[PDB]
């Protein structure tokens, strides 16, 4: 009924704060993005450094994989996203059009679109083929913290420091829903669950929440961790037991029982804020990454 994640590998190479870590859909790779303007690719099972991807002028806030594990998309302070062919390292497109820091990016499932969120308070939908920007949405009244497509690409969920999550219609560009609770703390992270039916949202009041999308109703909450300042990713972990996983400003990775909401494990080991965590698509592996006073990435494995 509890997991037993244990540190197995530690992966150093970034010269500044790590901003995001993502496993690839095929289970083979980890991608990490840093304030140092670099993407590094690491063996997902052994931590073996693999290669560095370069080309952003300023720091990178976020990276994301395409469905086939062959592309990355990066979001940088340089106001652009870049689309990368991971095997060649070649930068295929640079998406230009945001007027400030791009904070968050994601592919849709079909992987012919990219969605991005910016300090400029907009959400833009792009063509991964042509690089052209297909839509700009006046999404929020503060910086956008996350953007995620749902399981068939028809919906986008965004979150903002303005305290809202919104669900947008991909084709039409129309705001279909605005999620609000009793209070409106800034929302630092949002994503759909794999089956498209729930939304996991993190707010800068030391709180994660699970929303039923179609009823716009909040089902569970998870607390015990520290999150008042940074956009700390949250994950569904589903390959063994059923957990939520999140970084934390007290340097620990928290893991909660999905259903009870009870904290079941606190992974001790990093030395600065744990900004990002990722869950391996098929194995009970967790990756964690920390900020400036640490710069390392950590691989944990559990029996469930």
Binding positions for ligand XKN, rule: CB under 6 A: 193-195, 197-198, 210, 219-220, 236, 238-239, 242, 258-259
Q: H or E segment at 87?
A: none
Residue 235 near which of ligand XKN, Cl ion, its own copies, none (CB within 5-8 Å, type-dependent): Cl ion
Instruction: Give least dist CB 233 to Cl ion, A.
Output: 8
CA 32 to CA 288: how far, in whole Å? 10
Instruction: Give least dist CB 69 to its own copies, A.
Output: 8
- Residue 221 Cα to chain centre, angstroms: 19
Choice between 23 and 222, CB closer to its own copies: 23
CA 230 to CA 39: how far, in whole Å? 20
Judged by CB under 8 A, does residue 88 bind its own copies? no
Q: Which residues does 237 contact at the CB level (< 8 Å), separation at least 6? A: 243, 244, 245, 255, 279, 284, 286
Instruction: Give least dist CB 183 to its own copies, A.
Output: 32
Instruction: Give least dist CB 168 to Cl ion, A.
Output: 17
Choice between 101 and 211, CB closer to its own copies: 211
Choice between 150 and 257, CB closer to its own copies: 150
- The torsion defined by the Cα of 22, 105, 156 and 239, in degrees rounded to 10, comes to 0
Choice between 161 and 236, CB closer to Cl ion: 236
Residue 258 near which of ligand XKN, its own copies, Cl ion, none (CB within 5-8 Å, type-dependent): ligand XKN
**C-alpha separations of 208 from 195, 255, 273 in Å:** 19, 12, 17
Instruction: Give least dist CB 152 to its own copies, A.
Output: 5
Tokens describing residue 278: 């990722």
CB 206 within 8 A of CB 226: yes
Instruction: Give least dist CB 90 to ligand XKN, A.
Output: 31
CA 277 to CA 233: how far, in whole Å? 6
CA 128 to CA 92: how far, in whole Å? 9
Judged by CB under 5 A, does residue 277 bind Cl ion? no
Judged by CB under 8 A, does residue 26 bind its own copies? yes
- What x-and-dash track marks residues 96-135 binding its own copies by CB under 8 A? -------------xx-------------------------
Question: By C-alpha distance, which of 283, 270, 303 is closest to 46?
Answer: 283
Instruction: Give least dist CB 195 to its own copies, A.
Output: 6
Judged by CB under 5 A, does residue 236 bind Cl ion? yes
Judged by CB under 5 A, does residue 235 bind Cl ion? yes
Q: Which residues does 164 contact at the CB level (< 8 Å), separation at least 6? A: 140, 178, 179, 180, 184, 187
Judged by the rule CB under 8 A, the positions of this chain that interact with its own copies are 26-28, 67-68, 109-110, 151-153, 195-197, 239, 282
């Amino acid at each position: 009924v509890k997991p037993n994640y244990a540190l197995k590998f530690t992966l150093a190479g970034h010269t500044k704060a790590v901003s995001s870590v993502k496993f690839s859909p095929n289970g083979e790779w980890l991608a990490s993005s840093s304030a140092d303007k670099l993407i590094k690719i690491w063996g997902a099972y052994d931590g073996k450094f693999e290669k560095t991807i370069s080309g952003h002028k300023l720091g990178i806030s976020d990276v994301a994989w395409s469905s086939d594990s062959n592309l990355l998309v990066s979001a940088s302070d340089d106001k652009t996203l870049k689309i990368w062919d991971v095997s060649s390292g070649k930068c295929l497109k640079t998406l230009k059009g945001h007027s400030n820091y791009v904070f968050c990016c994601n592919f849709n499932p079909q992987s012919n679109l990219i969605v991005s969120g910016s300090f400029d308070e907009s959400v833009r939908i792009w063509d991964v083929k042509t690089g052209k920007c297909l839509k700009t949405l006046p999404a929020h009244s503060d910086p956008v913290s996350a953007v995620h497509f749902n399981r068939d690409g028809s919906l986008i969920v965004s979150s903002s420091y303005d305290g809202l999550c919104r669900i947008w219609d991909t084709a039409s560009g129309q705001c279909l829903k605005t999620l609000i609770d009793d209070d409106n703390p800034p929302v630092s992270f949002v994503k759909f669950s794999p089956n498209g039916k729930y939304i996991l949202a993190a707010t800068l009041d030391n709180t994660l929440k699970l929303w039923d999308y179609s009823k716009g109703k909040c089902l569970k909450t998870y607390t015990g961790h520290k999150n008042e300042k940074y956009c700390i990713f949250a994950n569904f972990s589903v390959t063994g037991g059923k957990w939520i996983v999140s970084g934390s400003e007290d340097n620990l990775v928290y893991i909660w029982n999905l259903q009870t909401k009870e904290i079941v494990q606190k992974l001790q080991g990093h030395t600065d804020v744990v900004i990002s965590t990722a869950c391996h698509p098929t194995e009970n592996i967790i990756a964690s990454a920390a900020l400036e006073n640490d710069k390392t990435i950590k691989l944990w494995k559990s029996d469930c």
